[PDB]
Design a protein around this ligand. Structure first.
Ligand SMILES: [Zn+2]
Length: 257
């Protein structure tokens, strides 16, 4: 039904799951690399976010992720992210739970103040050593000196073609292994531990929100339907149970007041 009917459910909901999609990041001007304007140079983003592309050209893969890390400098969380964060803070002092399950890798939910965050696809600001497996936070600009001035999005740009030795290297003593971005690539599974946390949130929630994506599309498809099958209401906020059409920065400040 209406927004007034959603607010009734929202006022009584004690454990809210928020499934956050690409729409939420696109509203902050964050480049998504899906759709028609989801291109970097002469390749598809799907072409680069793969174990195969990193094995054959780690320099080109690192140039792509270096760009994505650098564009975040000028990006700020929108009214959607803020309303989500303030909602968690406020409801937490009332002994009620708000959890954000996101596929976004830009950390804007983290900058807005969301604490209960599940980043199922990893983060741009995390590296993983291909030799020792250590996962680490990395906000350094540029991530390595050979990547200084590299990663121009424009097609025609020559490959930086950095030797593997000069790409980001693990700083753990005696390792020096090749680092990769700590993100889920095409053909890779989600971390089972992260999946267990997700499963647990979905099974205990009394309200579920799907924002800047829909329930009939991945990853919200692996999550939101089994919530609706338990009887629990699902509200979708998108540019396309309850459904609310429009930007998240418009509908969420209101819904989550
Ligand atoms: Zn290492």
């Amino acid at each position: 039904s209406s927004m007034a009917d959603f607010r009734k459910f929202f006022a009584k909901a004690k454990h809210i799951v928020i499934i956050s999609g690409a729409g939420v990041s696109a509203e902050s001007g964050v480049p998504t690399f899906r759709g028609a304007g989801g291109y970097w140079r002469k390749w598809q983003a799907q072409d680069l976010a793969t174990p195969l592309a990193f094995a054959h050209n780690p320099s080109r893969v690192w140039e792509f992720y270096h760009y994505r890390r650098e564009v975040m400098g000028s990006k700020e969380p929108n009214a959607g992210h803020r309303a989500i964060a303030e909602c968690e803070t406020r409801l937490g002092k009332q002994g009620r739970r708000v959890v954000v399950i996101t596929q976004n890798i830009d950390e804007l939910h983290r900058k807005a103040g969301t604490k209960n965050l599940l980043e199922i696809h990893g983060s741009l600001f995390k590296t993983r050593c291909t030799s020792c497996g250590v996962v680490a936070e990395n906000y350094k600009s540029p991530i390595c000196p050979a990547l200084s001035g590299k990663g121009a999005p424009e097609p025609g740009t020559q490959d930086a073609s950095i030797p593997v030795e000069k790409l980001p290297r693990c700083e753990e003593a005696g390792c020096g292994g090749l680092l990769r971005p700590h993100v889920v690539w095409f053909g890779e599974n989600l971390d089972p531990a992260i999946l267990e946390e997700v499963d647990r949130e979905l099974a205990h929630c009394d309200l579920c929100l799907v924002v800047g994506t829909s329930s009939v599309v991945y990853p919200a498809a692996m999550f939101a339907p089994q919530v609706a099958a338990r009887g629990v209401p699902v509200a979708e906020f998108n540019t396309e149970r309850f459904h609310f059409q429009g930007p998240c920065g418009t509908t969420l400040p209101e819904a989550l007041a």
